[PDB]
Amino acid sequence: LPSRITKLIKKSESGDFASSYQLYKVFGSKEYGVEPDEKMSDYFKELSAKQLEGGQLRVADIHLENYKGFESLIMDFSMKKNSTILVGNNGCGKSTILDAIQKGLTHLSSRLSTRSHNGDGIEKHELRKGQNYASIAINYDYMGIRFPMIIATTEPGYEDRAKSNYSGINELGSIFKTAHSINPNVSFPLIAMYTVERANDVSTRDIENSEAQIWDKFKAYNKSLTGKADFKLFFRWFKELIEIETALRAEIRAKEKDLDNPLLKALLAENKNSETTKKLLEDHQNSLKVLKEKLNSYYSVNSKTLHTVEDAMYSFLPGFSNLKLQRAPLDLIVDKNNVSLSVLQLSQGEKTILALIADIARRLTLLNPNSVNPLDGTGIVLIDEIDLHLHPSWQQNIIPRLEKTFKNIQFIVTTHSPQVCHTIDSQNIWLLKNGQKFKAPKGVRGAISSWVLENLFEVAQRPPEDKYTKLLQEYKNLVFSEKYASEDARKLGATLSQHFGPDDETLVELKLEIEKRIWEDDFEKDQ
Amino acid sequence: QRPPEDKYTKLLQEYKNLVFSEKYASEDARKLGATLSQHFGPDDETLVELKLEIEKRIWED
Amino acid sequence: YASIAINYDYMGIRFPMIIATTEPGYEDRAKSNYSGINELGSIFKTAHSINPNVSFPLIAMYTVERAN
Amino acid sequence: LKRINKTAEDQFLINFKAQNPNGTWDEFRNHEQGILYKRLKQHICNDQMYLCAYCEIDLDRENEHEIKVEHFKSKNWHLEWSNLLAVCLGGTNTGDDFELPANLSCDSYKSHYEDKNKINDKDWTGKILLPLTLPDAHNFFTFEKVTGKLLPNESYCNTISIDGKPAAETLSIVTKTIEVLNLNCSRLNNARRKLLFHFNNCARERNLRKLHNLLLQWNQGEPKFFQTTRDIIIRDDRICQGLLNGTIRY
Ligand SMILES: Nc1ncnc2c1ncn2[C@@H]1O[C@H](COP(=O)(O)OP(=O)(O)O)[C@@H](O)[C@H]1O
Numbered sequence: 001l002p003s004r005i006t007k008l009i010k011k012s013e014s015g016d017f018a019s020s021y022q023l024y025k026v027f028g029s030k031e032y033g034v035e036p037d038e039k040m041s042d043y044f045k046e047l048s049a050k051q052l053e054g055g056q057l058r059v060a061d062i063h064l065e066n067y068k069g070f071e072s073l074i075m076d077f078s079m080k081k082n083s084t085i086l087v088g089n090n091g092c093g094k095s096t097i098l099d100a101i102q103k104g105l106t107h108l109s110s111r112l113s114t115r116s117h118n119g120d121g122i123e124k125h126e127l128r129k130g131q132n133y134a135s136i137a138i139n140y141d142y143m144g145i146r147f148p149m150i151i152a153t154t155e156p157g158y159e160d161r162a163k164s165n166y167s168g169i170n171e172l173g174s175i176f177k178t179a180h181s182i183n184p185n186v187s188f189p190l191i192a193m194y195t196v197e198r199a200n201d202v203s204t205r206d207i208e209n210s211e212a213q214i215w216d217k218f219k220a221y222n223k224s225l226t227g228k229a230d231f232k233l234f235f236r237w238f239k240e241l242i243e244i245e246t247a248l249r250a251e252i253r254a255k256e257k258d259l260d261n262p263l264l265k266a267l268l269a270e271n272k273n274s275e276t277t278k279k280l281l282e283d284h285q286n287s288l289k290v291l292k293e294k295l296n297s298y299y300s301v302n303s304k305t306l307h308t309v310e311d312a313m314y315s316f317l318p319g320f321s322n323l324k325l326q327r328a329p330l331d332l333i334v335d336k337n338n339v340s341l342s343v344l345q346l347s348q349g350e351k352t353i354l355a356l357i358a359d360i361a362r363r364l365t366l367l368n369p370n371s372v373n374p375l376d377g378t379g380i381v382l383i384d385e386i387d388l389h390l391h392p393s394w395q396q397n398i399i400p401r402l403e404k405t406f407k408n409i410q411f412i413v414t415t416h417s418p419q420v421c422h423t424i425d426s427q428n429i430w431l432l433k434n435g436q437k438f439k440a441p442k443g444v445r446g447a448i449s450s451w452v453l454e455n456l457f458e459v460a461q462r463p464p465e466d467k468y469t470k471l472l473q474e475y476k477n478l479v480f481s482e483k484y485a486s487e488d489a490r491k492l493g494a495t496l497s498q499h500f501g502p503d504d505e506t507l508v509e510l511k512l513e514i515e516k517r518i519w520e521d522d523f524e525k526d527q
Numbered sequence: 528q529r530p531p532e533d534k535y536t537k538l539l540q541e542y543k544n545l546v547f548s549e550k551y552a553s554e555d556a557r558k559l560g561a562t563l564s565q566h567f568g569p570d571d572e573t574l575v576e577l578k579l580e581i582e583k584r585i586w587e588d
Numbered sequence: 589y590a591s592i593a594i595n596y597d598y599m600g601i602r603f604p605m606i607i608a609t610t611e612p613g614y615e616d617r618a619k620s621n622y623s624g625i626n627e628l629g630s631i632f633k634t635a636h637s638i639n640p641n642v643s644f645p646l647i648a649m650y651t652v653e654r655a656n
Numbered sequence: 657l658k659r660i661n662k663t664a665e666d667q668f669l670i671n672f673k674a675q676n677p678n679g680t681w682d683e684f685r686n687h688e689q690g691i692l693y694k695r696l697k698q699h700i701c702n703d704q705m706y707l708c709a710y711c712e713i714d715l716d717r718e719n720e721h722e723i724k725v726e727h728f729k730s731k732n733w734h735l736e737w738s739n740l741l742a743v744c745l746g747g748t749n750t751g752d753d754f755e756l757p758a759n760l761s762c763d764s765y766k767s768h769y770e771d772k773n774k775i776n777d778k779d780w781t782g783k784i785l786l787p788l789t790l791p792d793a794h795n796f797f798t799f800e801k802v803t804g805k806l807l808p809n810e811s812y813c814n815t816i817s818i819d820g821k822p823a824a825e826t827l828s829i830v831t832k833t834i835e836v837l838n839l840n841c842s843r844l845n846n847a848r849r850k851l852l853f854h855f856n857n858c859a860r861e862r863n864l865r866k867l868h869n870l871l872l873q874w875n876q877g878e879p880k881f882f883q884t885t886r887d888i889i890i891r892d893d894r895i896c897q898g899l900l901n902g903t904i905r906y
Contacts (some may be wrong), residue, residue, distance in 0.1 A: 199655050348652060389652070396530055423530055427750050438756040441747055443567040446535035448528050451571075455759060455842060480801040509853065516859045520895055523904060561719055568747060569722070570713045570761075570843045572850060578714065579854050582880070586873050 002032055012047060017055070018144035020048035021175075049179040055143030056082075056378050056408045057189040059101060063137035063150075066128040068096040075437055077412060078428045079141065083403060084412045085424050087440070087456060088432035094414040098382050101412070102193040102225050104138040104151060105380065107166065109191040109225055111173035113218035117166070122153035133160040140168070147172050188217060188367045190379020190409065194356065195227030196388055201355040202343060206232035210330050212240060220366035227384075229355040234362050235332070238325070241306050248295050255291075259284065295327040305365075305374075312361045312375060312405055316353050316398075349389035356383075360406065376407040383413040387420050395419035418452040431456065472496060472506070479510055484517040538563055539573070546577050552585060591618045596628060603628050658712065658883040659790040660704045665737055668692045673735050681727075681734045697725055701742045707881055708744040709787055710837045711762040711844065714881045715744070726763045728786060730770060730778035738788065747843075758841075765838040782819045784833040789819060796830060797839075798888055804848035805840045806884075848885050855889050864906040868899055875900075 005026070012019035026034050027041035064073045070093055077084050088094040107119035122134045132155035140147045147168025154162050179186055213219070215237065223230060258264075268274065300322075303310070314320055322335040332343035346354070360381060368374040387395055396419045402411060415421045421429060426444040430437060440456055450461045462469045475492040483489065493511070500507055530536045542559045550556060563574060591608040603624025610616035635642040672684055672692055685693040701723060706715040716722040724746075727739045746764035748755055757768055770778075780786075795812035799805055808830040817823040834840065858866055874886050890896045898904050 196655055199652050397532075400532070423533065431756065433756075437754065439751045439754050441568075441756060441759050442750045443571060445566060446530050446533045446539065447567065450528070476802055509856075512860055513856055516856055519859070519862050520893075523895065523898070557718065561716055564714075564716060565719075565722065568843060569716070569744070570711075570847050572846050575847050575850055576854070579851070583854075583873070 015051050017048050017051040020044050021145050049182055052179050054187055054378055058141045058410055059138055060141035061139040064100055065135045066131050066133050069093050070096060081428050082410050083424055083428055085421050085429035086414045087421055087429055092432040095384060098384055100136045101138060104136055105191055106225055108169055109221050111169055112188060113221040121151055132158055133162055135162050185370045187378055190363055190367055190377055191224055192363060193225045193382040196385040197227045198229045198352055202231040202351045204344060206235060207330050210239060215366055217367060217369060220363040229359040231355050234358045237362055241304060292328040299327055300324050308375060309361045309365055313354055313357045316357050317350055352389050378408045380410045386413045387415055387417040392419045396423055399423050418449045422447055422449060422452045479513055484514050546581055551581055589617050657785060657787040657790055658879060659787050662788055663703050666699055669696055681731055700740055704742055705879055709741045711744040712882050713744050728780055761838055761841050766836060769836055782821055784836055797884055804845040851882055851885050871899060
């Protein structure tokens with residue numbers, strides 16, 4: 001064995017998964033003239049299974065051929081920075097790349113927490129119209145090692161070189177499986193893709209259906225790469241966690257049956273003038289209120305490790321506190337500016353952000369069983385149309401806080417607004433042109449939104465159709481056309497000064513130019 | 528218009544106020560000038576304005 | 589108590605409306621009234637009766653649920 | 657193009673020329689840790705007064721990573737003195753080559769246009785203006801005050817010859833120069849517009865003393881960035897000409 005092998009072994013002894021897997025590959029082949037011995041390969045695999053403190057699993061590159069509407073879109077997602085903004089246009093193919101990654105990622109999600117090998121391939125409506133050689137190839141990247149994977153399809157009447165491999169991800173699944181059964185507390189990779197279908201978020205259909213499972217690690221992968229932030233699962237987790245802490249419930253059952261008897265209704269209808277009975281009815285309603293208040297007071301006292309998850313959703317929505325539910329007819333209660341109110345009546349964007357953050361936090365806490373800081377895990381989260389229901393105040397803040405609350409999470413997202421796409425550095429935002437990928441020009445990390453719109457989205461800051469815009473254009477043409485006072489500059493100035501106002505940094509400059517021109521015709525009189 | 532909490536935006540503000548005040552050409556003027564010229568490009572709106580005015584009021588001195 | 593009032597306009601002639609509710613523990617202090625919308629419906633129905641091809645207004649809202 | 661004054665030939669360039677008569681620019685840059693490379697870069701930039709060749713932007717005094725060296729003829733031209741020039745970054749160096757066109761300014765747009773046009777003849781001499789051969793005072797590029805886009809002047813082009821070519825086609829050469837070097841991008845147009853802004857601002861008071869101060873500050877002293885725009889503004893304005901020739905006194 002060469003001294004390089006000994007150096008690699010020594011490096012791997014000091015907690016280095018990269019060296020362990022390199023020696024595994026060397027033992028599995030004839031690299032560096034090393035004799036093939038599966039025994040030392042198994043020993044190296046066992047050593048590597050104990051070295052998975054965290055690798056920040058990414059997606060690195062992507063290779064698409066004749067998929068959706070693209071022909072060849074080799075793209076390199078960022079590795080040193082945990083963000084990527086896919087800007088594109090409406091109809092250029094933003095969701096194409098994200099959909100390709102989620103079809104690739106379903107196989108990975110299966111091979112983490114399932115058995116067997118199940119995954120989805122290219123369907124009939126996904127193949128490009130004209131050719132049949134479709135293939136998705138996403139090269140994953142663990143801490144120092146890469147696993148190829150190609151998803152391919154071929155029409156029955158032809159045979160292209162679309163040989164689907166699935167060669168690499170099997171090794172990743174195997175190493176995670178081996179590492180799981182030595183210490184049942186491991187930081188499993190997170191997988192989640194979130195479409196625009198989260199708009200139909202929290203509603204009565206989930207809360208009212210509340211009326212068990214121990215929340216194992218292999219759960220949170222379930223129903224993750226679907227495209228909706230299911231509040232029903234979060235509500236069930238909330239109930240299950242807080243139930244860890246009957247006569248009143250039995251009393252509620254008995255009082256409901258007694259007060260709803262048909263005989264009581266008939267007696268009430270027979271004698272409308274029942275003030276003496278009305279007093280007893282109001283006493284019963286007071287007992288109702290007292291019992292419900294006591295049952296709810298048996299709740300809003302203490303909490304558990306759920307507090308860390310709760311702190312994640314109070315940061316994205318300022319002015320929100322005291323999130324509990326009600327042991328009366330089921331509902332979830334927030335407090336907004338000292339106004340306690342139900343979750344079902346929150347704003348659309350507020351509910352969207354709440355459901356999104358709650359779902360991600362639930363996933364992160366279920367994957368990480370025992371950690372001092374469960375909320376900063378390793379995984380991949382995909383968001384489609386992040387600016388769907390958000391005010392511009394939250395648009396320039398959504399991502400910088402998202403990268404801070406969740407640290408080691410990749411956030412490949414698609415945007416449709418300049419405000420959100422000017423908080424990310426220019427080298428990590430991708431523009432999809434008609435058919436090719438282009439990089440943004442320098443000066444986006446802290447530039448003005450107008451500049452971003454003008455040189456990243458190809459849109460004028462002034463609508464090039466309105467009457468007032470055309471009038472301003474004619475005015476700016478006339479001021480510099482050697483006739484600064486030929487009665488039409490006068491008319492248009494009298495119009496625009498009254499419209500925009502005498503104090504705006506578009507007409508103040510041009511009026512200053514007019515004043516300079518007025519001065520220029522004073523000393524020339526003697527000439 | 529610009530980010531309310533961004534490191535480069537804070538550098539822009541810390542450059543602009545020093546341009547319009549003491550320390551027009553000192554310890555930090557050149558270094559922030561170079562840092563904000565590497566990004567945003569060396570040819571934009573705000574920085575050319577600031578450079579022109581610093582040239583004007585260093586010529587006056 | 590809550591109350592919503594809307595005034596509908598047609599050719600400079602206006603139709604009143606008010607829709608209200610009261611919690612069932614206190615005597616209602618705002619009763620519903622639909623005086624003008626019955627008027628408008630009757631006018632349009634009579635116009636249809638005399639002539640089957642009289643143009644009618646369009647009423648519709650498109651909620652965010654049109655995403656899917 | 658403000659035009660530069662090519663100084664006398666330096667010694668270490670000749671020393672590197674002697675050792676390898678057939679060598680590339682990368683060979684000169686890599687050899688001896690690039691000490692001679694940055695020495696030659698400093699020589700060329702000091703000759704040029706730290707202003708961009710075709711783009712006219714304030715090249716950084718301290719950091720030398722913001723300055724690139726390119727050749728008028730596409731890259732033995734790699735060693736000839738009549739080919740080396742110093743240019744701006746062009747908006748690149750954040751990426752490598754996968755950047756949106758129609759925004760690049762100085763030289764990276766030149767390479768992009770060369771590749772997408774498939775121009776076999778890399779000798780741009782006689783096709784676009786060469787800063788070395790330009791006269792000290794040239795009218796040429798005029799610009800409208802609306803958008804700030806520099807445009808050729810037919811009157812002055814029709815009465816001068818450039819690059820050993822007939823004077824009839826000089827206007828075509830200037831238009832080709834504009835097209836290849838992309839001298840009408842948004843950033844440079846905005847810079848010219850704000851140069852006009854700062855020329856106009858001091859003129860509100862009509863204080864001829866401060867106006868003469870502006871003329872002395874621009875025309876005299878070491879040349880500054882966008883020198884062509886300053887010259888065009890000064891010549892175009894009648895009162896500036898009257899102040900320069902002594903018609904107006906304060
Ligand atoms: N069989 C096909 N052939 C060619 N193009 C297709 C085919 N199927 C889908 N597409 C393309 O898919 C595009 C849909 O865009 P999409 O990926 O949803 O991104 P976004 O919704 O952000 O605009 C369309 O522009 C369409 O041209």
